[PDB]
């Protein structure tokens, strides 16, 4: 019996995972409590104890999102999967969607919407700015979409998009409002129901500090009604709102087999969410806002120039212009080799033009602000002509 | 300023995760080494230490699969994600796909294929049997598909589908062969390249005993060529072979950002794959076959009746007919309440018809076989007249 491929020598070496200060825009450092929880034994996907953990997670995301939506659950996918499922469920071929573009995430949602067969329209912000309510209204009137997509915290540009009045306006025009809060939840106000948002998701690895790979989502009654009026099945079984909602106990129905949830990731997320709910939103958001303000002061004292408009800044991700003369990638490598601290470059329209420093979860403390300020400064000084 | 939803009391309680013997068809009990590795700190999704782990995983999957395919990687999704991606990438609207149905997985693959816009044909095995080559050949001739989908180990019926000569036959007729090995890999022979299989995936949580949620996949040169002649983009960015392949270092292009992989699931999977590679395929699969043989002798001696034809049995999942007068659910509950041991009912077409005992990874040992034999018999005797 002949085996042309042999057992890899590489796998006889130990697994190596250096412990780093992750001060890029994500993932953030997991609290030790969430790491310890991910050593717990595996559970069956339909076991009562798993379902209880899932039930507890739902309450926690409703608190974090500030929603009472019955269709609140998590997707067994990284944060992109929230963008996929939201678009996949709420679009049919030819539907017109308006993308509010405030950075990379406008490009990515436009791409997915087009892959799903929608008629994609885009309104773009001014550079380093959010979209105004006027700009949103004007584009809505022009395009008459059935879905408007906005990113609350665009992590490529470090920009926080204001949301008040936008859901109400959409609903004057038979439009659903989808909002990405992956980078913004916990670091800026969010009230899903109050702001009349129809679909929303965040990530597990940003402010929460859970492992990447499971993503909380919620759909309003209006979004559920849209799903119910579809003429065809959603294109992906794996994302189908009704089926994963049933698995997560949301609607009238028996819990059945949809897929095997990762109980490991459930454990870390549940613990991450319990930590956040224990701090509470007012203190959690104020802590990130206050660390950002400390960072701005340190950066601006040192002669650095910030990318985003001062009125439009996202506390969790700070974009900073790469100074004339500096190789951003060399600066990044210097900080990592010398200190095991991560500083990042840009994303999409800001690739090569900015650094991005994340202040998220475990990392949004005055001590870690000071540490990243110190090492960012040295790394740039070390590579500058 | 007003929080209508209050921090949940439920999340103030300890997280509880009982340590059970998972002798259902998955997940299986994780080795302590995999649980330990999942407390390791998170890493950046594009850090060299993360890419190294991915590179090492690729080598281990090529070993396990027996393939040299360059397009080998893992999807950030549970096992259904392998089915989704394999179908998403290799099908365009109207493509004829033939599903070889040997149980539930035939229904699920037909469902996804139809959702993706394909023209779906089905050829169904005899009850509790695999498809014969002649049955496959006849169906190929009737339908002239461009893809054939088989499930090597159908865990709903406990049936192992024979694959020798089928990829060769498909290729004589201008057809790709996709194979699900989620339940069979490590428990039955598999030689991806030797058997001329064009796309294949397995699960992390079955024989491997990693956490659920990341799924090894591979695509042959012919599959890659099919992808390249598409005239439409694949519907889901999250599953796009060429983009996840680039993130995984497969095609000679720069690694870029596609999505944040889960560090935690990489660590558990890496370690589970290293362990399986250490044991080696000959010994791994013989161990699962020998344990199944012991289980069969124990079951039949006790007067139980096996569901799958004796020539078509899958070692890792044994379907046993529910005896007349036994409430299978009640029996399952008795075993869990008294011993914290999981035994399962059926799935799709075998629902209400069978118990399923999984012998996978850590649980394919003579000791655990003896344990499940003992608890199963006791559970059944407890609820029977």
Curated annotation (Swiss-Prot), chains A, B:
Reaction equations catalysed: glyoxylate + L-alanine = glycine + pyruvate
Cofactor annotation: pyridoxal 5'-phosphate
Residues that coordinate or bind glyoxylate: 155, 356
Example GO molecular function: alanine-glyoxylate transaminase activity
Major localization listed first in the record, in broad terms: other
Keywords: Aminotransferase, Peroxisome, Pyridoxal phosphate, Transferase
Pfam families given in the database record: Aminotran_5 (PF00266)
Enzyme class: transferase
EC number assigned by the record: 2.6.1.44
Residues that hold pyridoxal 5'-phosphate according to the record: 78-80, 205, 257, 260
Tissue expression summary: Expressed in head and abdomen of adult females.
Subunit and partners: Homodimer.
Protein name (record): Alanine--glyoxylate aminotransferase
């Amino acid at each position: 019996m002949e085996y042309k491929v042999t057992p890899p020598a590489v796998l006889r070496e130990p697994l190596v995972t250096p412990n780093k200060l992750l001060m890029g825009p994500g993932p953030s450092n997991a609290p030790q409590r969430v790491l310890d929880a991910m050593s717990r034994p595996i559970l069956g996907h339909l076991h009562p104890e798993t379902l209880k953990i899932m039930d507890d997670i739902k309450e926690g995301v409703r608190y974090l999102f500030q929603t009472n939506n019955i269709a609140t659950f998590c997707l067994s996918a990284s944060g992109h999967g929230g963008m996929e499922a939201t678009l996949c469920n709420l679009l049919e071929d030819g539907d017109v969607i308006l993308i509010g573009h405030t950075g990379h995430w406008g490009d990515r949602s436009a791409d997915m919407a087009t892959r799903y067969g929608a008629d994609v329209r885009v309104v773009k912000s001014k550079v380093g700015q959010s979209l105004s309510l006027d700009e949103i209204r004007d584009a809505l009137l022009i395009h008459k979409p059935s879905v408007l997509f906005l990113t609350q915290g665009d992590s490529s540009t470090g920009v926080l998009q204001g949301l008040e009045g936008v859901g109400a306006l959409c609903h004057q025009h038979n439009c659903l409002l989808i909002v990405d809060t992956v980078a913004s939840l916990g670091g800026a106000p969010m009230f899903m129901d109050r702001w009349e948002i129809d679909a929303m998701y965040t990530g597990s690895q940003k402010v929460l500090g859970a492992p990447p790979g499971i993503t909380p989502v919620s759909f309003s009654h209006r979004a559920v009604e849209r799903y119910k009026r579809r003429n065809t099945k959603v294109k992906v079984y794996y994302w189908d709102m009704s089926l994963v909602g049933d698995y997560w106990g949301c609607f009238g129905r028996p819990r059945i087999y949809h897929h095997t949830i990762s109980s490991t990731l459930l454990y870390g997320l549940r613990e991450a969410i319990a930590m956040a709910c224990e701090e509470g939103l007012p203190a959690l958001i104020a802590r990130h806002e206050d660390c950002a303000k400390r960072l701005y002061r340190g950066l601006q004292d040192a002669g650095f120039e910030l990318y985003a408009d001062p009125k439009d800044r996202l506390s969790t991700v700070t974009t900073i212009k790469v100074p004339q003369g500096v190789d951003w990638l060399k600066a990044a490598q210097y900080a990592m080799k010398t200190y095991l601290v991560e500083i990042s470059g840009g994303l999409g329209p800001t690739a090569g033009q900015v650094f991005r420093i994340g202040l998220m979860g475990q990392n949004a403390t005055t001590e870690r602000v000071d540490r990243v300020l110190q090492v960012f400064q040295e790394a740039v000084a070390a590579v500058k002509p």
